[PDB]
Symmetry: D2
Subunit: 203 residues, 4 copies
């Protein structure tokens, strides 16, 4: 169930960290520091290789929010593979969701393969429910899902990923590729958005 961040977690003062100046007024607190995300991701990579390392893996990135987690998770997986006795090749693909998948290879590349789906965040779990359905029709050897964040919410349809970075409360977070109206993707920490930031970048 990953690293549990409780509802009462204050987070960290912005001034205790290096923060891009253009977002200085737009953030309330640092919620999950970049380095903590790395540490957690290093362990997740090992759990992935343990469960899925026996056969060729197709890593599927869910753009856009998933791009940072995906890149770093794969870098840790690569670090394992070039310092071990045994490994399996990995292929990568990228998709965007619209219950319609856009971009990416013909999903026949997934049959017979060990498919790892990489998301930034699970909320109600409906987005993942639909995607898994589309994927399992192509009869892959195995489908697992890694999500950096899983929200505790009375709206979850019951779905839970196989790999979870952090279990967080239902707050709106940004950073580490997670966005608010396309903003805050260029931020290494996961942070909570300020009220003024929310008004300034509102559409």
């Amino acid at each position: 169930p990953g690293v549990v961040i409780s509802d009462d977690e204050p987070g960290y003062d912005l001034d205790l960290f290096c923060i891009p100046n253009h977002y200085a007024e737009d953030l309330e607190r640092v919620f999950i520091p970049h380095g903590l995300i790395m540490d957690r991701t290093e362990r997740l990579a090992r759990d992935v290789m343990k469960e899925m390392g026996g056969h060729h893996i197709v890593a599927l990135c869910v753009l856009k929010g998933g791009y940072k987690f995906f890149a770093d998770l794969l870098d840790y997986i690569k670090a394992l593979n070039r310092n071990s006795d045994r490994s399996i090749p990995m292929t990568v693909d990228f998709i965007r969701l619209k219950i319609k998948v856009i971009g990416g290879d013909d999903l026949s590349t997934l049959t017979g393969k060990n498919v790892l789906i990489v998301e930034d965040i699970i909320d109600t779990g409906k987005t993942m429910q639909t995607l898994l359905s589309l994927v399992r029709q192509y009869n892959p050897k195995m489908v697992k899902v890694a999500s950096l964040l899983v929200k505790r919410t009375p709206r979850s349809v019951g779905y839970k990923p196989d790999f979870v970075g952090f279990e967080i409360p239902d707050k709106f977070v940004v950073g580490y590729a997670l966005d608010y109206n396309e903003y805050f993707r260029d931020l290494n920490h996961v942070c909570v958005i300020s009220e003024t930031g929310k008004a300034k970048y509102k559409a």
Copy 2:
């Protein structure tokens, strides 16, 4: 202009580096070490911000091969922006070229991030499409640029390495979808060249 790698560059013995096990007999030499790419990319990030830091930047990744260079270049740019501030907001988008609405590019500093440029036709093609939507500025960063008389003449704005006319893999560059899961840029061996075809 970038780091010039000559035609006679021997590259490195694989045994001198950490190489993923499943590619051990599929590679011949390490051509550009992962860390050398990182060092070059750090300098490129600074060059990008000197040129494009005056206004909102849309970073445009050309999938799939550009994804690694893209992620690392942006990491270095972000390091600059949080440690010398003095900074500019940046948005990102991703596109694949098959041989978001491009109105989002209007009035912005667009940086196209590419893995490799050979003839330069792909980039010229992409640029002609982008410029229809009137960005304030378009620049292209390419990790690799091949030395070849087959070049149509197009020169990108930011170049990591100028390399000879060799087929290279690694750092997200593929051979029939293989070798993307490799941190070094390397040259493929004959054994590997006939196993993944």
Copy 3:
């Protein structure tokens, strides 16, 4: 700024959530400060340091042994600032043990911005002593960066100029902090189990 405040009742992190050196699996209780969190805090400290000390040649003094990890990473962040900024300053380094053992002649400190880098402040007596010696070599300025500062009644009231984390009165190991020379080979700051405390007991 007292740095990042870790309260008395911070439970820390379950070991199974992180990559832990296998030979220390039973020897640790909880992860207290993850390595990455140390890195992020250290990055800001590096900027804080240059802001105050970047006007003149800096001599960075590492207090061995426990200070070596924090020292290496802090300097790495400082160097990152120095090669990506319009202007910068030369930095020289030296290493001392406190019993002052080793190190160059302290006349090398004369006229320089001296940065003392420590792993942990407890009572503050070690630093007060060192500071009162260093001043007699007339540095341009002298500052102390400590990764950790303990909340203790035992404090003589010395506070360093740069602090990573303010922690409760617990014994911690990792990130070069040792328990009888063990646990220096650990990237996280952690709390030692009863099993490991007896197993590595002198």
Copy 4:
């Protein structure tokens, strides 16, 4: 393994292609070994060390000051291996050499241990041949030397782990110094003539 062989006619890289401290901008001639390349080689050396020296307790011995960076990074890669694999324990010590051994714990700590000596550079090999000659009479289980650099020169010894074999050029950076300067530099570089004059003692 003689390590990564850098040939005598190695031109190095233009400084302008890399991020370099402005205070050294006129003091360096060329970048010789980029920091990232050092990392890549060190990663592999870490696996080589652990294959040969694991598993018994390893005492890692850093030869200050030049060795401190290579020491810190080599040990970081070793620790990455120790926390992402099956089975692996190290203690560290730091020594300085007087032209004797200064600082350090009493070398009785080395007895019955796997001792890894970590150095920045080997020239004549005298410094280390003399050091090994001392360490051994404390009867360690084994003693190995990892050196970042070995120069091609008249040499009265061969280390067990080598990062790079370099020509007979004076190099600085990555903790390697010229009269205490250039330690605050991530790349290994060749010193310019103005840099020699400027920081001359």
